[PDB]
């Protein structure tokens, strides 16, 4: 794909690492200076060293991998529960910002630098060295074997690392060491996913200030590492059976191996959507969660929480993080050769799709459902989101209507005519139409099912527009008939809108399809 995965000019592959890049004199001196400052617990000048030359020069100042780990640990020293320690370390807050916030900002900015290789903005050697440092940090952050509930190796011999003689930064154990414990990676994931929607101030602050940004960074880095592994670590041509074995060793495979549990499908579905609006089915056992770093769940007296986030904001961020987790899972899965299945993680694409569809179709709040299905970039999430949409649609049609019509819309995204014909078939079957067997008393749940159905179809329609554009909406009579059938379902729902069971108007998707590709309600108002 891009240069980040296919730039190996300056690499010096070794047994432990294939991305390894040797140090030059300037970078060696920078590494030595950063480690020397980190030894003295002068983290303020470490951050100042990194920030003072960020964006002000053509050449790039590369963060060493052990300094990256130090920054990862620093990002866990949030002010709301570590204010006295941070004030003691830096009594003269010359930057007017917490060490945690500065370290996290540097991590995210360097991740942004790494995600796109601007060979014109930065020379290629610095970018490759930065990639090597980040990959070394990730390889040091390999999860331990999942638990229900080796010290430090420096590849560079040119300098002594600061992490060799220490394991805590400011009373917080190093993030790699904390997560290289049997049941802490899954614990961290469940903790952040549960507290992403908490209304308790300490738990929400723990999720919002520490763990969601760190999880974002870690997932992005693991995705990049997975791409590099698939590009280089594998042996290109393969008997399709050794490739599965190599994929079982992939960084995402080890990442999700700490999430295997007993049954990956259902437990994973509960894990990703933990503390969501869906009703818990089959009385699944509650997942214990504990703070990762001592008193994360307490607010120190000196700190005064003076920030308020609306429920939409929190739900949007939490659902985006959940989408990232699911997308990493599907990114690992889609490389599995057909017929074969992974050895170490007992994961199947169909099982995960069905589980996510079961959890999505069980949402009783439409806001979280839409937040999950509303994405700002369609191309980025294009490889799994349509599958989840079609699966949730199929399950909703299954529970609402006794006759389950097989949906081929995903491969019908290739041909708009086929997609429109299938939409016509579903709506004429009245499965997409509002169902008469639903009683007056249970009208609200039927409305919920229909509005979720409309959301799923809208997602598939946006993807169809993304793959074919707007060319034959009226030129092909099939799409015109699809629009008229949407109007027919509009009339069908309006029948009960006039039946006056509730004052609230039922969900009608004609205006939305009109705005997207209905040509503003066809010729109702245009002509």
């Amino acid at each position: 794909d891009g240069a980040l995965i296919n730039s190996v000019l300056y690499v010096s592959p070794r047994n432990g690492a294939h991305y390894f890049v040797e140090l030059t004199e300037k970078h060696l001196l920078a590494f030595e200076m950063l480690n020397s400052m980190c030894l003295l617990e002068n983290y303020d000048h470490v951050l100042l060293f990194l920030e003072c030359q960020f964006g002000k020069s053509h050449n790039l100042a590369v963060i060493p991998f052990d300094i990256i780990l130090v920054l990862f640990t620093l990002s866990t020293l949030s002010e709301y529960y570590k204010e006295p320690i941070l004030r003691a370390n830096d009594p003269y807050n010359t930057s007017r910002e917490t060490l945690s916030r500065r370290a996290l900002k540097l991590l995210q900015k360097y991740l942004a630098i790494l995600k796109e290789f601007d060979s014109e903005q930065y020379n290629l050697y610095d970018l490759e060295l930065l990639r090597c440092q980040f990959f070394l940090a990730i390889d040091t952050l390999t999860p331990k074997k999942q638990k229900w509930g080796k010290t430090f190796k420096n590849p560079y011999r040119s300098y002594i690392s600061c992490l060799e003689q220490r394991n805590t930064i400011l009373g917080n154990r190093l993030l790699n060491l904390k997560l290289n414990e049997p049941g802490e990676f899954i614990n961290m994931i469940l903790w952040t996913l549960s507290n992403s929607l908490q209304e308790s101030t300490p738990l929400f602050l723990s999720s919002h200030e520490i763990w969601m940004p760190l999880l974002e960074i870690l997932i992005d880095l693991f995705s990049c590492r997975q791409d590099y592994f698939i590009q280089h670590e594998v042996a290109q041509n393969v008997s399709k059976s050794l490739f599965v074995q190599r994929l079982s060793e992939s960084p995402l495979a080890v990442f999700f191996e700490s999430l295997n549990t007993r049954n990956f499908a259902n437990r994973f579905s509960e894990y990703v959507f933990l503390n969501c609006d869906y009703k818990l089915p089959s009385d699944n056992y509650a997942t214990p969660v504990h703070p990762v770093y001592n008193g994360e769940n307490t607010i120190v007296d000196t700190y005064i929480p003076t920030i308020k986030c609306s429920p939409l904001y929190k739900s949007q961020k939490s659902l985006a993080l959940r989408r990232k987790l699911i997308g990493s899972c599907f990114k690992l899965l889609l490389r599995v050769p057909d017929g074969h299945r992974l050895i170490t993680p007992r994961i199947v694409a169909d099982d995960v799709i069905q589980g996510i569809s079961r959890t999505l179709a069980s949402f009783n709040d439409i806001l979280q459902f839409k937040k999950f299905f509303m994405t700002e970039n369609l191309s980025q999430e294009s490889y799994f989101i349509p599958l989840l949409a079609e699966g949730t649609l199929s399950e909703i049609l299954k529970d609402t209507q006794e006759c389950v019509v097989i949906l081929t819309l995903v491969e019908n995204l290739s041909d708009g005519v086929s997609f429109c014909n299938e939409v016509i078939g579903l709506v004429k079957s009245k499965c997409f139409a509002f169902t008469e067997q639903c009683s007056q008393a249970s009208y609200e749940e039927a409305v919920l099912n229909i509005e979720k159905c409309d959301v799923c179809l809208l997602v598939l329609l946006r993807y169809l527009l993304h793959l074919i554009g707007t060319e034959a909406i009226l030129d092909a009579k099939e799409q015109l008939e699809m629009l008229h059938a949407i109007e027919k379902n509009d009339s069908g729902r309006r029948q009960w809108a006039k039946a006056l069971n509730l004052g609230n108007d039922p969900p009608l998707l004609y205006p939305i399809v009109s705005q997207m590709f209905g040509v503003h309600d066809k010729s109702v108002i245009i002509e």
Binding site: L40, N42, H45, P91, Y92
Partner: protein
């Protein structure tokens, strides 16, 4: 009554001198506290 009024005079003089001493010592202590904090920061920076 003369002895008691002289007693009040000496009592008020001792009271005023005690408050003068208390202000002097409190001012010295506050100045020393601020100076100690500044010196601690200076020494930490120099040592680093």
């Amino acid at each position: 009554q003369e002895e008691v009024i002289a007693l009040f005079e000496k009592c008020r003089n001792k009271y005023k001198e005690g408050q003068k001493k208390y202000m002097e010592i409190d001012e010295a202590l506050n100045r020393l506290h601020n100076s100690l904090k500044a010196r601690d920061q200076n020494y930490k920076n120099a040592e680093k």
